[PDB]
Ligand SMILES: C=CC1=C(C)/C(=C/c2[nH]c(/C=C3N=C(/C=C4\NC(=O)C(C)=C4C=C)C(C)=C\3CCC(=O)O)c(CCC(=O)O)c2C)NC1=O
Ligand SMILES: *[C@@H]1O[C@H](CO)[C@@H](O[C@@H]2O[C@H](CO)[C@@H](O)[C@H](O)[C@H]2NC(C)=O)[C@H](O)[C@H]1NC(C)=O
Ligand SMILES: *[C@@H]1O[C@H](CO)[C@@H](O[C@@H]2O[C@H](CO)[C@@H](O)[C@H](O)[C@H]2NC(C)=O)[C@H](O)[C@H]1NC(C)=O
Ligand SMILES: *[C@@H]1O[C@H](CO)[C@@H](O[C@@H]2O[C@H](CO)[C@@H](O)[C@H](O)[C@H]2NC(C)=O)[C@H](O)[C@H]1NC(C)=O
Ligand SMILES: *[C@@H]1O[C@H](CO)[C@@H](O)[C@H](O)[C@H]1NC(C)=O
Ligand SMILES: *[C@@H]1O[C@H](CO)[C@@H](O)[C@H](O)[C@H]1NC(C)=O
């Protein structure tokens with residue numbers, strides 16, 4: 001049931017600083033008040049991140065991006081628009097692929113043989129008689145077979161209302177693929193701002209290490225699409241969210257651990273002579 | 276009579292990464308001519324029993 | 325599985341939920357969460373100089 005959309009306004013890409021963001025815990029040990037120098041894959045300070053947005057002026061961005069050495073993904077949004085990711089090497093039935101999707105009731109992680117659509121997306125419909133927003137579309141993949149790893153969580157229910165205002169949620173993820181392990185580090189911050197990433201400091205903690213054992217070179221982002229009576233392949237409305245992507249590089253860092261065992265500051269040992 | 280239910284991969288483009296699994300059954304191209312998804316001369320099935 | 329020698333004495337600290345061992349500046353064993361009765365009792369050296 002794959003559908004390829006038509007209404008899309010052309011727009012040049014945008015680039016942004018990285019500030020001091022995208023640092024994670026490299027070990028699970030509890031250390032207190034320790035200045036530790038390490039060498040690992042990190043996001044360089046004040047690097048060049050790429051900007052994509054979904055606003056409605058017909059902007060709906062979900063291209064295929066490389067996965068050279070693990071990525072840093074930042075999402076600024078007020079409503080739940082960004083729904084997940086797909087990782088792979090060719091994104092067709094010839095090779096295995098990984099899919100992480102929140103379908104508003106459960107979060108699903110599957111490593112199968114997928115046949116992905118050209119423009120994968122999720123959908124939400126708005127009803128005026130009872131003013132309800134409900135999930136009504138899963139136009140992601142056509143077929144799935146020869147699956148190896150499958151995981152679904154406990155059921156829940158989240159809000160799908162298209163609220164209007166400022167971006168109240170910033171979510172940061174670091175994705176790595178080492179020795180057959182897909183490592184995901186995550187962090188969440190509440191904000192009240194618009195149009196840009198807040199400069200500051202990140203404190204991403206480990207989230208999951210999935211033993212999937214596949215080969216990953218490309219990835220794509222799966223968003224949500226709004227449909228209502230105000231509007232097929234043209235009768236749709238975008239939301240309001242933004243996501244920034246950056247690539248990790250082999251660097252040397254100097255991490256600082258406070259008395260509570262938390263990372264509070266870091267120094268990138270490649271930026272300026274003072275560092 | 277022979278048990279033929281166990282298989283192994285004979286040809287690949289490059290060596291595997293540690294703890295990596297590959298179950299694709301694409302036709303391997305040994306020669307310079309393209310295989311076009313069919314077996315023949317210098318075009319072998321990657322798995323054997 | 326962590327073996328050692330010393331004198332056992334009650335004390336207190338706090339751990340993150342996915343953390344069990346806590347080291348020192350000298351990279352020795354400071355703190356450990358007891359498995360049966362979930363407490364945060366630690367260890368002190370025995371020999372006196
Ligand atoms: C896609 C994978 C995905 C992951 C790994 C995930 C993890 C995750 N999301 C949470 C909250 C949440 N998760 C979301 C939503 C999201 N947060 C996201 O990572 C993304 C992409 C959304 C979707 C837009 C929201 C809104 C909450 C807060 C719910 C609450 O506070 O009750 C929590 C805290 C729940 C708890 O501590 O009991 C975890 C661990 N959520 C996900 O949806
Ligand atoms: C809110 O209104 C919508 C629109 O009628 C309801 O969706 C209908 O649900 C029934 C079954 O529950 C279906 O038979 C209809 O086909 C649905 N309508 C459409 C247009 O698809 C929805 O159930 C309502 N939500 C409530 C009452 O909580
Ligand atoms: C979308 O979320 C729903 C949960 O509402 C998932 O539904 C599961 O469906 C299978 C088969 O129909 C059942 O065995 C499960 O019990 C359902 N889960 C529940 C009720 O929590 C559904 O799998 C999700 N979509 C995808 C693609 O995974
Ligand atoms: C993981 O997938 C990538 C993408 O297909 C593989 O890289 C290709 O390898 C072939 C074989 O030599 C080359 O002809 C291509 O030019 C490569 N493409 C790119 C983009 O690098 C890679 O070999 C795979 N990993 C392993 C271990 O086989
Ligand atoms: C877009 O989707 C349509 C219908 O799903 C399909 O026929 C078409 O080939 C797709 N576009 C491309 C470039 O494949
Ligand atoms: C980032 O990349 C773009 C294009 O690759 C380039 O024009 C720009 O100078 C780079 N640096 C910054 C800080 O945007």
Ligand SMILES: *[C@@H]1O[C@H](CO)[C@@H](O)[C@H](O)[C@H]1NC(C)=O
Nearest residue numbers: 016017018019046047048199
């Ligand atoms: C970083 O600061 C601002 C945006 O935060 C930008 O204009 C400036 O050029 C950046 N400096 C760099 C990339 O050195």
Ligand SMILES: *[C@@H]1O[C@H](CO)[C@@H](O)[C@H](O)[C@H]1NC(C)=O
Nearest residue numbers: 113145146147297298299300
């Ligand atoms: C992959 O799918 C094909 C088609 O059903 C099947 O013949 C083959 O045995 C499957 N391979 C594995 C490893 O599951």
Ligand SMILES: *[C@@H]1O[C@H](CO)[C@@H](O)[C@H](O)[C@H]1NC(C)=O
Nearest residue numbers: 257258259260261262264338
């Ligand atoms: C460590 O955590 C405790 C518990 O909330 C808190 O009271 C204390 O302020 C924290 N330490 C620092 C330096 O913030």
Ligand SMILES: *[C@@H]1O[C@H](CO)[C@@H](O)[C@H](O)[C@H]1NC(C)=O
Nearest residue numbers: 357358359360361362363364
């Ligand atoms: C047995 O295991 C339980 C479960 O954690 C624990 O509370 C208890 O202290 C352990 N020991 C005994 C003697 O029950």
